Each structure stands twice: as C-alpha cells, then as structure tokens.
Design a protein around this ligand. Sequence first.
Ligand SMILES: Nc1ncnc2c1ncn2[C@@H]1O[C@H](COP(=O)(O)O)[C@@H](OP(=O)(O)O)[C@H]1O
Ligand SMILES: Oc1c(Br)ccc(Oc2ccc(Br)cc2Br)c1Br
Ligand code: NA
Length: 291
Amino acid sequence: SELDYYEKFEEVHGILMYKDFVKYWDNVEAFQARPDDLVIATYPKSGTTWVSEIVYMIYKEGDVEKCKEDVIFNRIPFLECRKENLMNGVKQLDEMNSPRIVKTHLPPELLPASFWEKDCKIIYLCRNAKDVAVSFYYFFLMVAGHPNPGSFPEFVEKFMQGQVPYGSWYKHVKSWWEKGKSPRVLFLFYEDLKEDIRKEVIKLIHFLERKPSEELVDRIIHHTSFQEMKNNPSTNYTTLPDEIMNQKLSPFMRKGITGDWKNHFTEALNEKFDKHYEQQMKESTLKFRTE
Ligand SMILES: Nc1ncnc2c1ncn2[C@@H]1O[C@H](COP(=O)(O)O)[C@@H](OP(=O)(O)O)[C@H]1O
Ligand SMILES: Oc1c(Br)ccc(Oc2ccc(Br)cc2Br)c1Br
Ligand code: NA
C-alpha cells in the first residue's frame, strides 16, 4: 500500500505527482505561454470539466456543434499530462491555434513561469474538501495509474496529509486564494455554480470580455448541465478505453451534487476531518460551504 503509492507517485517541487508526468517535467517547466492563453486551474475533482465546457462555449459564442468537433481533452489540453507517447499536453498546446485554453491542476508555485510573465488570465475553481475527497476516491478506483486507495477512511487520511497527486488541497486552495486578488485571476466555487449557474456564467462572460445575452447564457446553461454533459461523449470521457478509465466501476460524471460526503463520511471520520480542517484553514479568509 505505502509501497503501492511509491510505485505510482513521485514528488516534483515538493508536490506529489503521477510518475508519468514527472519523467518529462522539463517540458512543463519550459512551456511557452502566449499572452492570450487562458488557464483553467483546479485541484483534482473540483469541477474542471464543468467550467472548461462553459469556457469553451463562451469562446465559440454558444455554438454547440463547434464544441463537439473533438473530445474535451483534445479541445482543452491538460498541460502537465504525459503518457510517454500516447498523450502529451505540452505537445498538444504547442501545435494549437490560438486562443488556447489550458487545463492544469498545479498549485500557483508550480505553474510554468511563462504564464505569469505573459500575464495570462487564469480561472481557478474550487470545491469543498469533503466532496473533493469522495470524488477523488472513486477516481483512484476507476483510473489506471493509481494505487489501491483502500477503504474510504484510509484514503481520507492520505487526503488530510496531502499524500495524493497534486498534494495538499488545503495549501492548493489557500495559495490560489491569494492569487485570486489579482485582476487576472478569477476565483470560483463549485458550490456557487450549483446554487446559481446563471450568475456564475454571466460572471465568466464578463471576465472573458464577451457580450452577455439571454440566448447565449441560456444555451450554456442547459448544454453544461450535469445530465447533458453526462450524456455527451465529447465531455464524459467514454471514448477512453476501460483499461485507462473503467467507467463500469464508476462513471466520470458520477453524481454532480454538493453534499455527497454525507453518504460516505462516518460520524467519527467527520469529527476527525473537521478538527484537522479547522487547524489547516483557521488563518484564512477563504470560506467554503459543505451544503
Ligand atoms: N456539468 C456538471 N455539473 C455538476 N457537476 C459536474 C459537472 N461536470 C463534472 N462534474 C463533477 O465534477 C467532478 C469531476 O471533476 P473534474 O472535472 O475536476 O475531474 C465530478 O464530481 P462527482 O464525482 O462528485 O460527481 C463530476 O460529477
Ligand atoms: O484530471 C485528471 C487527473 Br487529476 C489524472 C488523470 C486524468 O486522465 C487520465 C486517465 C488515465 C491515464 Br493512464 C492518464 C490520464 Br492524464 C485526468 Br482527466
Ligand atoms: Na481576482
């Protein structure tokens, strides 16, 4: 188990990471941004796919046909991702026509310097830690390249210690929260998109300097709803073989709610998690909602 984690993950810049990504990290380090690049940054399982498709629709002015020209992981490359010669974020971005949309899970300190130098806009999305933990747990189960996460309480213990890919959720959100004070960084909450999607969609349109209209806004809302994205082969990862993502164990578009932690955390695990959480987050103005 601890052996299993050792075979699967390695630290880069002090951050635990998928071994396959780390082998070619120089390519990520030296990545060349363009001024009009748009970065979408999230801790894993925080709703990256959701905000990505919303952003893509705003770029394509709500043209759904244009959003299905290829699967989402080809339309919006995963920056640091690398599967030897099978998948390559940096390569996919290099060959791309601008404007590029870049997916990443990196904490601000690990983001390639070029993005900061060229002052690229960044959208950061976060989600309450308990729901993230649940989603990440099933992800470990479904996706190749992860160790056996064991029981859920055992996994949550690794989560609390930041011993999962991309490290501590606590440090991630807190570091990005500081960056969010910049005008170039828009800080969003998964729970806010659940609560009032129209409000956040209009917020996104204004941030990307586009014109808001009811028709465009309406098209984004139903196109990016959970049920639609779950049924969309462009966005639900079902074009991937089971040996890579086995959605028969658990679909990528799993439940899409806030509060699934209530269905997994025991009373004791919740008490332990909450206590640890208060200590990690006490000195921060960042406040989440678990419901
Ligand atoms: N349109 C949508 N509406 C609500 N939740 C969505 C969504 N698209 C993806 N998600 C949720 O976001 C999580 C995946 O995150 P990511 O895209 O960062 O990998 C999954 O959470 P759950 O496992 O709780 O259902 C998934 O269901
Ligand atoms: O958000 C993701 C995280 Br975190 C980790 C992996 C991944 O996709 C993959 C799923 C299986 C393999 Br083999 C390589 C990749 Br990348 C995604 Br999307
Ligand atoms: Na800001």
